[PDB]
């Protein structure tokens, strides 16, 4: 996926370079780097300065997060949030020939990271859904009222969908709740032993772990150490569960060579003792795990060393979830947004084919 859906080529979503430089309107599903290619390129800025009626649309949270970065503040005058599950009419003007197109857009929650949404577009060339990145459990799409008309799913011409784990190997992934419970109980069994027992959550430098931090903090009464928390300045229910102070039993700090540090009983922020008593440190790396069709779930926690663990965590839907979602949507066409590492377009397209009307 390179930004443009065939049905509405004058809009660009999650890609801002190359052909997307002529967009009549821009959309951002969420603040992950690989969906923000070109979003602050000079050539785009140049183009915004001679095209005054071009806006960027996203969720309220996405607006807030994007605008906390100094490098995207230039968007301030041109960003419009759209409320979640609130169908909103948008006008797309031709800068030169003066053509006018109207589209109605509805934001649906994607379950991927703070601010993450799917965009349902309705207009005079059919209904389309761009999912962005999503993780939706079975039944979640069936509950989304604005995907339906008169008790049946809307007629959807094309779905542009997150196919990150769209291969039958990734058949099942433990739920959000199961992942959280496993991590909670591992952390609780360690940090309640003494004040000197500490956990390092080894996380990627990306939004989407806040669900985990918030819940661990709420349940355990401990704030989580992070490198930077200023992006949540106006998000109290996230902010108050994080800290920049090193004196805490849960850390999600980050440092360029941080797994070497852990192999010498140092956390990334450098704290190794308190009252000259060494901290007893375990590492927990949230990581995607999956089970095949014919298997049962195994433990969300995998022990990798005396003091090291992997914990199930997924930003994206399983293959069974993708199939259930698309089966339910029953669009005419389905377009993979991404080719999983070990497969091809043809295999992914052909996996999806039987779930579509043409
Ligand atoms: C290499 O180190 N790996 C992991 C780990 O477990 N990674 C998982 C793996 O193999 N994954 C897959 C995928 O298949 O690409 C991905 C999908 S790639 C992607 N996801 C987005 O949401 C997005 O917006 N853009 N992009 C490009 C997620 S990580 C996961 C890790 C976890 S924590 C930590 N410190 N390292
Ligand atoms: Ni993402
Ligand atoms: Zn730390």
Residue numbers in the entry: 4 to 361
Relevant lines from the article:
Artemis (SNM1C/DCLRE1C) is an endonuclease that plays a key role in development of B- and T-lymphocytes and in dsDNA break repair by non-homologous end-joining (NHEJ). Artemis is phosphorylated by DNA-PKcs and acts to open DNA hairpin intermediates generated during V(D)J and class-switch recombination. Artemis belongs to a superfamily of nucleases containing metallo-β-lactamase (MBL) and β-CASP (CPSF-Artemis-SNM1-Pso2) domains. The overall fold of the catalytic core of Artemis is similar to that of SNM1A and SNM1B (2 Å backbone RMSD); it has all the key structural characteristics of human MBL fold nucleases, with the di-metal containing active site at the interface between the MBL and β-CASP domains.
The results show that neither cefotaxime nor 7-aminocephalosporanic acid inhibit Artemis, whilst ceftriaxone inhibits with a modest IC50 of 65 μM. We solved a structure of ceftriaxone bound to Artemis (purified by IMAC) at 1.9 Å resolution in the space group P1 with one protein molecule in the asymmetric unit. As before, in this structure Artemis possesses the canonical bilobar MBL and β-CASP fold with an active site containing one nickel ion, likely reflecting the purification method. Ceftriaxone binds to the protein surface in an extended manner making interactions with the active site, towards the β-CASP domain. There is no evidence for cleavage of the β-lactam, nor of loss of the C-3′ cephalosporin side chain, reactions that can occur during ‘true’ MBL catalysed cephalosporin hydrolysis. Electron density at the active site clearly reveals the ceftriaxone side chain coordinates the M1 site nickel ion replacing two waters (72 and 106) in the uncomplexed structure. Despite the conservation of key elements of the active site of the MBL fold nucleases and the ‘true’ β−lactam hydrolysing MBLs, ceftriaxone, does not interact with the nickel ion via its β-lactam carbonyl (as occurs for the true MBLs), but via both carbonyl oxygens of the cyclic 1, 2 diamide in its sidechain (Ni–O distances: 2 and 2.2 Å), i.e. it is not positioned for productive β-lactam hydrolysis. The amino-thiazole group (N7) of ceftriaxone forms hydrogen bonds with the side chain of Asn205, while the S1 of the 7-aminocephalosporanic acid core of the compound interacts with the hydroxyl of Tyr212 through an ethylene glycol molecule. Without a metal ion at the M2 site, as in the ceftriaxone bound structure, the Asp37 side chain is positioned away from the active site, as seen when nickel is bound in the M1 site.
